[PDB]
DNA sequence: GGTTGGGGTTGG
DNA sequence: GGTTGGTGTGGTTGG
């Protein structure tokens, strides 16, 4: 995260961290949604591109994380995941559309101060909140600046942008499933989602019910933190009827 | 159900230090 | 077909 | 201590 700063401890208990077995490093962010499911970027998982194709059998979460490296000691829970579940139109060509899995972990993580859910939104409140100038809050232990590797998790409020500045900002091709946010160049205050930061939450609290809401995951964008750049998001609502879906099948 | 609430924050009447900039924008 | 087999955990 | 124990130099882990 640029331009960030250190999270306060529980600030932000939703924040999983993806860590891969060996060699045992960070690959990404992601984001608890029930006890059984963390909520992540299809990328990654699954970047042909990079030659990145990860299994069930590879990875770790590790949650209720503040430190990077070290390992909380009666703090963090460590899950095991049972079944990877990338979204079907998930597009790794084109403009990484659809950039979004569901992680189903072995066993349940019992909550505690520093592990609890995030909640996803709805019509009414991805529709009341969703506005532009709107800002939300950016976690991860990503990148501090473009080339970073903080010590402790990091937070940035960024602003939601509209689509027509969206467009005009990036060759990439954009579809409805994203959106961008960050500060534009005249706007004094900066900051941006960075490599590393993937998978990590989009959150904005409710003015009515005081709660919450995952809105969206940082998914990609040219560079870390460039004037007239801003950085993409995966648009959490706009799949929410796929996430429940598969939770509903696979669940229960 | 219990989700969107932090047990040391929402749960303990208590903000962060941050939040309400979020809360101002809107 | 496709970034992929025969609506769907999924657009057209 | 700490967001947490306790001979364990570290440890599944820094200073
Ligand atoms: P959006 O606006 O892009 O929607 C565009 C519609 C394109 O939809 C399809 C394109 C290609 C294939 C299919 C489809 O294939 C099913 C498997 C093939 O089995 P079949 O028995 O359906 O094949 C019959 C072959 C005859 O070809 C046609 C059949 C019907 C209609 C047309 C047509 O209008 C133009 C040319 C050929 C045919 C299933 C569903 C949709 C699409
Ligand atoms: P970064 O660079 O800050 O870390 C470098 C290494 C510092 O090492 C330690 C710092 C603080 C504490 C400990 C430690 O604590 C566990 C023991 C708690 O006390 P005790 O019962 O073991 O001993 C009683 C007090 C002893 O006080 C000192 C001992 C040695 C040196 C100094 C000193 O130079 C200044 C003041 C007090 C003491 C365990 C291991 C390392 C560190
Ligand atoms: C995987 C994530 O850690 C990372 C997050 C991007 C952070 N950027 C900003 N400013 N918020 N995503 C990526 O690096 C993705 C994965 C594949 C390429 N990529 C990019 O963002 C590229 N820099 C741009 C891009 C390339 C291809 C398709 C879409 C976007
Ligand atoms: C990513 O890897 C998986 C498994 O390593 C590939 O999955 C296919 O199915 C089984 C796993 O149950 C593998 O043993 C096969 O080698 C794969 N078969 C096919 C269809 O080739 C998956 O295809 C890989 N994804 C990529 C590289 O796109
Ligand atoms: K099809
Ligand atoms: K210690």
Not at chain 1, 128 to 139: E, M
Not at chain 1, 162 to 181: G, H, L, Q, W, Y
Not at chain 1, 199 to 223: A, C, D, H, L, T
Request: aromatic share 10%; net charge positive; charged share 30%.
């Amino acid at each position: 995260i640029v331009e960030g700063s250190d999270a306060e401890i529980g600030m932000s208990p939703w924040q999983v961290m993806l860590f891969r077995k060996s060699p045992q490093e960070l690959l990404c962010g992601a984001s608890l949604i029930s006890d059984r499911w963390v909520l992540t970027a299809a990328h990654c998982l699954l970047y042909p591109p990079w030659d990145k194709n990860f299994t069930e059998n590879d990875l770790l979460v590790r949650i209720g994380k503040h430190s990077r490296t070290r390992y909380e000691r009666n703090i963090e829970k460590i899950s095991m995941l049972e079944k990877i579940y990338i979204h079907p139109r998930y597009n790794w060509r084109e403009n990484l559309d659809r950039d979004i899995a569901l992680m189903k972990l072995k066993k349940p993580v019992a909550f505690s101060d520093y592990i609890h859910p995030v909640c996803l939104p709805d019509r009414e409140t991805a529709a009341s909140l969703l506005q532009a100038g709107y800002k939300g809050r950016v976690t991860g232990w990503g990148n501090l600046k473009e080339t970073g590797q903080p010590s402790v998790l990091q937070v940035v409020n960024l602003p939601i942008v509209e689509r027509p500045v969206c467009k005009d900002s990036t060759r990439i091709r954009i579809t409805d499933n994203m959106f961008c946010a960050g500060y534009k160049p005249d706007e004094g205050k900066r900051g941006d989602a960075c490599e590393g930061d993937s998978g990590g939450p989009f959150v904005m609290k409710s003015p009515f019910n005081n709660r919450w809401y995952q809105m969206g995951i940082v998914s990609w964008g040219e560079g870390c933190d460039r004037d007239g750049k801003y950085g993409f998001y995966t648009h959490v609502f706009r799949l929410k009827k796929w996430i429940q879906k598969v939770i509903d099948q696979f669940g229960e | 159900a219990d989700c969107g609430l932090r047990p040391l924050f929402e749960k303990k009447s208590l903000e962060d230090k941050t939040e309400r900039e979020l809360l101002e924008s809107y």
